[PDB]
Amino acid sequence: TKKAVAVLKGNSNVEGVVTLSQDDDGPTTVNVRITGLAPGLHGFHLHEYGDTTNGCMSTGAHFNPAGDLGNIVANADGVAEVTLVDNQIPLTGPNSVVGRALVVHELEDDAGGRLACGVVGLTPI
Amino acid sequence: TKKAVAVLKGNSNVEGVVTLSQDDDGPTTVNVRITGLAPGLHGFHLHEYGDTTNGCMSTGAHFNPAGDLGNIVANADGVAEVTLVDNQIPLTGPNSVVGRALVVHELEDDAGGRLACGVVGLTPI
Ligand SMILES: [Zn+2]
Numbered sequence: 001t002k003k004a005v006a007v008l009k010g011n012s013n014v015e016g017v018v019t020l021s022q023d024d025d026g027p028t029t030v031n032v033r034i035t036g037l038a039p040g041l042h043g044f045h046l047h048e049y050g051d052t053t054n055g056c057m058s059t060g061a062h063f064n065p066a067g068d069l070g071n072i073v074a075n076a077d078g079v080a081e082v083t084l085v086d087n088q089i090p091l092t093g094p095n096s097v098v099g100r101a102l103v104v105h106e107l108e109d110d111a112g113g114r115l116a117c118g119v120v121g122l123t124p125i
Numbered sequence: 126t127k128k129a130v131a132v133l134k135g136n137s138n139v140e141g142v143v144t145l146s147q148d149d150d151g152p153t154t155v156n157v158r159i160t161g162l163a164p165g166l167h168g169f170h171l172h173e174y175g176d177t178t179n180g181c182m183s184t185g186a187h188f189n190p191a192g193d194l195g196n197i198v199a200n201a202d203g204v205a206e207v208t209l210v211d212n213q214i215p216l217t218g219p220n221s222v223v224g225r226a227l228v229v230h231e232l233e234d235d236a237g238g239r240l241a242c243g244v245v246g247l248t249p250i
């Protein structure tokens with residue numbers, strides 16, 4: 001019933017797309033496909049600002065109305081493809097993540113540099 | 126007081142930054158700086174979806190639920206720097222443009238190709 005998407009890019013080879021879906025006020029399903037990553041674990045976070053004026057550093061700190069979506073795993077080919085179900089990622093209401101940012105980190109979830117990021121935007125239901 | 130920003134990019138030479146500011150429920154101040162434009166008038170619109178998975182076409186239609194910000198003017202050097210005031214751009218509430226898209230068009234306000242676009246995101250202050 002509510003959907004969002006983020007296109008991730010940064011000052012690196014890392015690119016991808018994340019789709020988010022939430023039915024009513026239930027859990028948010030997050031579909032991740034990110035390429036160009038070093039094989040292994042990468043922290044995956046919601047950060048507070050949908051601001052990329054200064055690259056991924058403009059996105060501020062992790063979002064804490066919560067912001068930690070855990071690790072995503074890149075395979076030998078640099079691809080991280082996974083579906084997550086996270087209950088703390090509203091698409092509506094006071095704590096909505098719409099207009100905030102998703103960031104993929106260089107190192108495993110505590111972090112390292114912010115490899116890529118994208119603003120969370122509304123998308124057709 | 127709420128603020129938003131959009132970084133605009135597209136399949137073209139056009140890029141820039143737009144900030145939006147709103148106090149209580151009143152008029153929204155829009156600060157524009159876009160470069161790489163052909164000199165003259167360019168349609169400047171709010172579109173429905175902050176979805177750039179298919180470039181600027183995936184932002185959908187111009188959004189009203191208002192979405193027509195009029196023209197911006199690119200100077201001899203392709204720079205359009207202007208401050209607009211618009212009372213149809215909520216940054217809060219049911220009609221928030223947060224998570225939607227700003228689009229700059231090839232031609233004067235209908236508007237030809239979508240030269241550049243960006244997702245409207247939250248930013249400090
Ligand atoms: Zn982080």
Ligand SMILES: [Zn+2]
Pocket residue numbers: 170172187228230236
């Ligand atoms: Zn338009």
